[PDB]
Design a protein around this ligand. Structure first.
Ligand SMILES: *[C@@H]1O[C@H](CO)[C@@H](O)[C@H](O)[C@H]1NC(C)=O
Lengths: 210, 194, 212
């Protein structure tokens, strides 16, 4: 079972934020929404798809429609910046399934498209029987990107290692991804591409063996 | 003098799993192959016996237990299983000799706004013994503080509702389940096959 | 007074064993649904295990056969025994009360950290990221532990430098990159020397980056 959440949701202070959660059997399941502030433990903010726990502000509301559960945060304040997770119990696999997590960031800055630089393995690296592709993303806001590595046109997940976005000196965000492979796979492919998806816009950079 | 299996399988209304309905069958002949070859049952699993041999076998009593669960919980109605239905609602013995029959009842037990008349036990301190029944609705005490019969912190209502809807997935659709236990004591076997 | 307090986390070699404890106050563990839920650094929440009030247990596919959930009513404590540990188990582990079937998980612990790594003090490898205005790079690979210092031309080049935060590898090592934005007119004119200093291993390396 999979619970699908948008990785990032950005809303200006005082506006209304909506976080969706999709699943094949969500209509029959009880969806629970948890909030996790940076550095802390998760807190329950919605249970049984619409019920507010004691101590949770009234602006946190749960809604269910068909097979989609929506957490609505009204009159959003900057303190609500956090990672929000939807959770169910899937009885098809006897599992507690979590969503991918949505990074709710309260906008206090103009949106900035990411700048991506891709570096192929060095000659000395291939001489040392190793190879590393270095994708570097910088100068993007909000600080949430999705990194996808492709060999020619086929997605690759083995050897992918990405950092959590980090604030720069200019209040913008940066991250780094590394693809590790043997020189065999490096020289037996057309090109290797790093795709960085930020706020629904994808920026792709490709390199080829020379 | 046919065994009254019709009023168990073709019953208009079915019991909740937490309050499952037992019907004793004795002093009649029963054709089990007609059961295995009719109504297009979703699941029909026999432990310790086969229907073809059942048609040529004799037993002291036959207990038919009827209830309604969701499809994904049908696999819980089996010996050696765990889970909410198996532990807190309906438990089969490890030596279970008998059959389990289940069929989809979405067209009967589902409603557009949600059918909440079917309930299952979610909270219980200890697992049920085999064939034990618990229809109590006393407020479950999770903490050390007494509950005094009111819902609150550490004070949960033991039963939960399925809320069956036609648009639900198959694993979350209402399935009707009949469990046939075959009891063979040191008494003349009055219920047999042709 | 309603709290969950975790303990037992720390550093464990791959293939080792470790027991996590979660002491409860404000409710009785033996009569509650109790879950262990872990979170890897930078990734999302992953449910690990649950124990029912009646004793039935469920585990995630990733930990099946290795982890064991248990409880002690005398100390009102939940326990998670973890054997045959691998690097992918490195995470912060929380204990929580409740069932996802209804009412959710309300009370959570503060979480304890578990790091499965065999990494020791190791010097880095410094490699050149050549350009095709133009971008030059120094790749620092497979070093432990933090931190490492990167400069360009003995620290005399600072305009346009960017030393990215290091990655935390599954093996337990670290790696980062440092980028300088230089003009295309100075590719074959000026020499660019990147100096990397790692004090734990006394490793100082200077590398020249030139176009291919
Ligand atoms: C239920 O009704 C159908 C109607 O055709 C019949 O064939 C079937 O035998 C009945 N069920 C039982 C258990 O007799």
């Amino acid at each position: 079972y999979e619970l699908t959440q948008p990785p990032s949701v950005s809303v200006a202070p005082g506006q209304t934020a909506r976080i969706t959660c999709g699943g094949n059997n969500i209509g029959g399941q009880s969806v629970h929404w948890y909030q996790q502030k940076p550095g802390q433990a998760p807190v329950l903010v919605v249970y049984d798809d619409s019920d507010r726990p004691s101590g949770i502000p009234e602006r946190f509301s749960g809604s269910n429609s068909g097979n989609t559960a929506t957490l609505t945060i009204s009159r959003v304040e900057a303190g609500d910046e956090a990672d929000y997770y939807c959770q169910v119990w899937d009885s098809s696999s006897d599992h507690v399934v979590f969503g991918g997590g949505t990074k709710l960031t309260v906008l206090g800055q103009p949106k900035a498209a990411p700048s991506v630089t891709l570096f192929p393995p060095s000659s000395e690296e291939l001489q040392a029987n190793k190879a590393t592709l270095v994708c570097l993303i910088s100068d993007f806001y909000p600080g949430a990107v999705t990194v996808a590595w492709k060999a020619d046109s086929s997605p690759v997940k083995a050897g992918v290692e990405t950092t959590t976005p980090s604030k720069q000196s200019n209040n913008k965000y940066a991250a780094s991804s590394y693809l590790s492979l043997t020189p065999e796979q490096w020289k037996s492919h057309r090109s290797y591409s790093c795709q960085v998806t930020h706020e629904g816009s994808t920026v792709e950079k490709t390199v080829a063996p020379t | 003098n046919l065994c009254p299996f019709g009023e168990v399988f073709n019953a208009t209304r079915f019991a909740s799993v937490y309050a499952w309905n037992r019907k004793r069958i004795s002093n009649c002949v029963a054709d089990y192959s007609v059961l295995y070859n009719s109504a297009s049952f979703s699941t029909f699993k026999c432990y310790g016996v086969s229907p073809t041999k059942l048609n040529d076998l004799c037993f002291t009593n036959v207990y038919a237990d009827s209830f309604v669960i969701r499809g994904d919980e049908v696999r819980q109605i089996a010996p050696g299983q765990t889970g909410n239905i198996a532990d807190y609602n309906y438990k089969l013995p490890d030596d279970f000799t008998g059959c389990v029959i289940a069929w989809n009842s979405n067209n009967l037990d589902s409603k557009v706004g949600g059918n909440y008349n079917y309930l299952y036990r979610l909270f219980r301190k200890s697992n049920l013994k085999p064939f034990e029944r618990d229809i109590s609705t006393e407020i479950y005490q999770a903490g050390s503080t007494p509950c005094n019969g009111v819902k609150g912190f550490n004070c949960y209502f033991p039963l939960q509702s399925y809320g069956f809807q036609p648009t639900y997935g198959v694993g979350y659709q209402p399935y009707r389940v009949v469990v046939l236990s075959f009891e063979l004591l040191h008494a003349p076997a009055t219920v047999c096959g042709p | 007074e309603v709290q969950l307090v975790e303990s037992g986390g720390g550093l464990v070699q791959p293939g080792g064993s470790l027991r996590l404890s979660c002491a409860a106050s404000g409710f009785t563990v033996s009569s509650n649904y109790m879950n262990w839920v872990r979170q890897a650094p930078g990734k999302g929440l992953e449910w690990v295990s649950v124990i029912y009030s009646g004793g039935s247990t469920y585990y995630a596919d990733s930990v099946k056969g290795r982890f064991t959930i248990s409880r002690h009513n005398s100390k009102n404590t939940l326990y998670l025994q973890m054997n045959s540990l691998r690097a992918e188990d490195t995470a912060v582990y929380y204990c929580a009360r409740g069932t996802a079937m209804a009412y959710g998980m309300d009370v959570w612990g503060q979480g304890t950290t578990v790091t499965v790594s065999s990494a020791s003090t190791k010097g880095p490898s410094v490699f050149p990221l050549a350009p095709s205005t133009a971008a030059l790079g120094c790749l620092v690979k497979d070093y432990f532990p933090e931190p490492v210092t990167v400069s360009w031309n003995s620290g005399a080049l600072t305009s346009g430098v960017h030393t990215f935060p290091a990655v935390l590898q599954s093996s337990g090592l670290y790696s980062l990159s440092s980028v300088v934005t230089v003009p295309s007119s100075s590719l074959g004119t000026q020499t660019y020397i990147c100096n990397v200093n790692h004090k734990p291993s006394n490793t100082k390396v200077d590398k020249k980056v030139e176009p291919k």
